[PDB]
Amino acid sequence: KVQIINKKL
Amino acid sequence: KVQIINKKL
Amino acid sequence: KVQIINKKL
Amino acid sequence: KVQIINKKL
Amino acid sequence: KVQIINKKL
Amino acid sequence: KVQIINKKL
Amino acid sequence: KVQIINKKL
Amino acid sequence: KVQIINKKL
Amino acid sequence: KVQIINKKL
Amino acid sequence: KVQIINKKL
């Protein structure tokens, strides 16, 4: 897996 | 796994 | 695993 | 494992 | 394991 | 920037 | 910047 | 900067 | 800076 | 700076 989980609030 | 979990609040 | 868990609050 | 757990509050 | 646990408060 | 540069050879 | 540069050879 | 430079040979 | 430079040969 | 420079040969 190559993955980015990005969450901006 | 290559992964970034990034969370900005 | 290569991983960054980054959390800015 | 290569890992950074970074938490800024 | 190569790891940094960094916590700034 | 949130970025992964992954290169497998 | 949140970044991983991963290179496997 | 939060960064991992990982190189496996 | 939070950083890991990891090199395995 | 929080940093690890790790080199295995």
From Swiss-Prot, chains A, B, C, D, E, F, G, H, I, J:
It is found in: Cytoplasm, Cytosol; Cell membrane; Cytoplasm, Cytoskeleton; Cell projection, Axon. The modification Deamidated asparagine is found at residue 6. Phosphorylation at serine and threonine residues in S-P or T-P motifs by proline-directed protein kinases (PDPK1, CDK1, CDK5, GSK3, MAPK) (only 2-3 sites per protein in interphase, seven-fold increase in mitosis, and in the form associated with paired helical filaments (PHF-tau)), and at serine residues in K-X-G-S motifs by MAP/microtubule affinity-regulating kinase (MARK1, MARK2, MARK3 or MARK4), causing detachment from microtubules, and their disassembly. Phosphorylation decreases with age. Polyubiquitinated. Requires functional TRAF6 and may provoke SQSTM1-dependent degradation by the proteasome. PHF-tau can be modified by three different forms of polyubiquitination. 'Lys-48'-linked polyubiquitination is the major form, 'Lys-6'-linked and 'Lys-11'-linked polyubiquitination also occur. Expressed in neurons. Isoform PNS-tau is expressed in the peripheral nervous system while the others are expressed in the central nervous system. The record marks 1 as: Not glycated. Glycans are attached at residues 7-8. It comes from the Eukaryota. There is a cross-link at residue 8 (Glycyl lysine isopeptide (Lys-Gly) (interchain with G-Cter in ubiquitin)). The modification N6-acetyllysine is found at residue 8. The tau/MAP repeat binds to tubulin. Type I isoforms contain 3 repeats while type II isoforms contain 4 repeats. Promotes microtubule assembly and stability, and might be involved in the establishment and maintenance of neuronal polarity. The C-terminus binds axonal microtubules while the N-terminus binds neural plasma membrane components, suggesting that tau functions as a linker protein between both. Axonal polarity is predetermined by TAU/MAPT localization (in the neuronal cell) in the domain of the cell body defined by the centrosome. The short isoforms allow plasticity of the cytoskeleton whereas the longer isoforms may preferentially play a role in its stabilization. Interacts with MARK1, MARK2, MARK3 and MARK4. Interacts with PSMC2 through SQSTM1. Interacts with SQSTM1 when polyubiquitinated. Interacts with FKBP4. Binds to CSNK1D. Interacts with SGK1. Interacts with PIN1. Interacts with LRRK2. Interacts with LRP1, leading to endocytosis; this interaction is reduced in the presence of LRPAP1/RAP. It is linked to In Alzheimer disease, the neuronal cytoskeleton in the brain is progressively disrupted and replaced by tangles of paired helical filaments (PHF) and straight filaments, mainly composed of hyperphosphorylated forms of TAU (PHF-TAU or AD P-TAU). O-GlcNAcylation is greatly reduced in Alzheimer disease brain cerebral cortex leading to an increase in TAU/MAPT phosphorylations. Frontotemporal dementia 1: A form of dementia characterized by pathologic finding of frontotemporal lobar degeneration, presenile dementia with behavioral changes, deterioration of cognitive capacities and loss of memory. In some cases, parkinsonian symptoms are prominent. Neuropathological changes include frontotemporal atrophy often associated with atrophy of the basal ganglia, substantia nigra, amygdala. In most cases, protein tau deposits are found in glial cells and/or neurons. This is Microtubule-associated protein tau. The lineage of its organism: Eukaryota, Metazoa, Chordata, Craniata, Vertebrata. The chain holds residues 591 to 599 of 758 of the full protein.
